[PDB]
Design a protein around this ligand. Sequence first.
Ligand SMILES: NCc1ccc(CNC(=O)[C@@H]2Cc3ccc(cc3)NC(=O)CCN3CCN(CC3)CC(=O)Nc3ccc(cc3)C[C@@H](NS(=O)(=O)c3ccccc3)C(=O)N2)cc1
Length: 236
Amino acid sequence: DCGKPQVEPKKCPVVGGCVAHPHSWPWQVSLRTRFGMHFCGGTLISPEWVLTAAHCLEKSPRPSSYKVILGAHQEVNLEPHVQEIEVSRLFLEPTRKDIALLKLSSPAVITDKVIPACLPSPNYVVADRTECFITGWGEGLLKEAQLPVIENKVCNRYEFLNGRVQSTELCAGHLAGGTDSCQGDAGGPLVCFEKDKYILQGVTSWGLGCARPNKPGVYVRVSRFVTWIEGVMRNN
Ligand SMILES: NCc1ccc(CNC(=O)[C@@H]2Cc3ccc(cc3)NC(=O)CCN3CCN(CC3)CC(=O)Nc3ccc(cc3)C[C@@H](NS(=O)(=O)c3ccccc3)C(=O)N2)cc1
């Protein structure tokens, strides 16, 4: 059952934002080096598959360099029931896009704290001003922020990101500054509530800094990679 947290998320009263309600984002994963240090996020999209950013894997093409922590809220002292699962294979997107799949060495156990996010339909375009959520441990409690999507044609204006955003990316952010995903959130989810569940629409990718005025974050547009993702899962 994807996209439906058993523990309901709360909105705020990651730079800025607020601490998430514990386990309300049950697809959020922490990507760690074999040494155990958190450095990137990811999203569980099925029991055996995590989606992350390709740049998070820049340091090593060896699956043994990585492990995934599922079900966590605190980053350092992992709570008793947290799942640590190794990675058996890495799949970088084949056209140098900032997205990648991790096949876990064993399927995650689905529980009230470990649940996959839903994937969008191919080529869906999140509408301008849609309020979505980003989550992560970045720049030790899991944080969230609610940010509005900014349509690419506005985001690509000189006043904002000046032609840098591709159709395979989306923009989201508060243009006054102060609230944003940042480095340790890379690879993690941008999700949007659709009808009754959360759909993974973006993968935290890059920005001109973090939380700066007129510089919204850039996310890989997951809907442009669903067909590729499905083919990798089907054939591996
Ligand atoms: N929500 C804010 C937020 C900010 C950062 C992060 C963590 N992620 C990074 O660190 C990324 C890592 C990255 C991502 C994608 C890359 C290459 C590298 N490649 C394509 O996806 C390949 C396809 N193609 C490439 C070209 N682009 C389009 C897409 C267009 C463009 O210009 N892209 C661009 C890319 C990288 C950078 C700058 C610009 C450098 C740096 N930005 S920064 O200002 O120096 C910085 C300093 C301090 C703190 C944060 C940022 C920056 O973000 N690197 C999470 C969240």
